[PDB]
Amino acid sequence: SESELKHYYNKPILERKNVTGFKYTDEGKHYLEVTVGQQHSRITLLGSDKDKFKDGENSNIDVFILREGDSRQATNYSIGGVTKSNSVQYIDYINTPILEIKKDNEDVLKDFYYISKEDISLKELDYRLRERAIKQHGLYSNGLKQGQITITMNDGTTHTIDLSQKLEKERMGESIDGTKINKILVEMK
Known part of the structure; x- marks a missing residue:
């Protein structure tokens, strides 16, 4: 529609370069957590990005973050948009x-x-x-x-x-x- x-x-975009994030798995799913200032984000990894970044701490990554839903909670829940710096x-x-x-x-x-x-x-x-x-x-x-x-x-x-x-x-x-x-x-x- x-x-x-x-x-x-x-939707507005949170876009930051040369950040550090933490990559983890939790119940068959794969996530990257990232904090930029007092702004807090969890990025779901679905495709080949699952294997492109190793679990644990990831430096020299750039991030392009968009909040999937309309709920107004402070933490950002986005999909993909993680790349190498x-x-x-x-x-x-x-x-x-x-x-x-x-x-x-x-x-x-x-x-x-x-x-x-x-x-x-x-x-x-x-x-x-x-x-x-x-x-x-x-x-x-x-x-x-x-x-x-x-x-x-x-x-x-x-x-x-x-x-x-x-x-x-x-x-x-x-x-x-x-x-x-x-x-x-x-x-x-």
């Missing part, structure tokens, strides 16, 4: 790829997307692209609600995301090489 999708993709710390490289956005198969923008992160999560790319389609092009308003983001890598590999649904939760912890994104296409209809 249209209004629910806009709700979800207008940049392995070059002393310079911040930012690379452009091409960014193209389409409504009803005509371009409405042809420009650039900027990427600072070596290891970047589909949770983050999904959220931020939808944020842009929503705020500047009126996804998900009247009722523009379908589909296709396509991220094309340097080797021709692609990742595609349906706009008519939230990103699949098992994909929110998947990550790609942000230094090697050649193009991002967002088609709306």
Whole structure:
């Protein structure tokens, strides 16, 4: 549903880099606990992120946190969005790829997307692209609600995301090489 999708993709984000978190298991499930200031978060690990970080204390991780429900308890319960921090710390490289956005198969923008992160999560790319389609092009308003983001890598590999649904939760912890994104296409209809 249209209004629910806009709700979800207008939730605020807690985004921090070079943090430390604690990875544990508890009743067949896998979690990462993280505290940034007096702000407290528990991130469920569902996909391949389960095996990508070893249980126990994890340093040099970046975090992209979104609170799944509407309950107003202080602790954040999020899914995925954990990646390895940049392995070059002393310079911040930012690379452009091409960014193209389409409504009803005509371009409405042809420009650039900027990427600072070596290891970047589909949770983050999904959220931020939808944020842009929503705020500047009126996804998900009247009722523009379908589909296709396509991220094309340097080797021709692609990742595609349906706009008519939230990103699949098992994909929110998947990550790609942000230094090697050649193009991002967002088609709306």
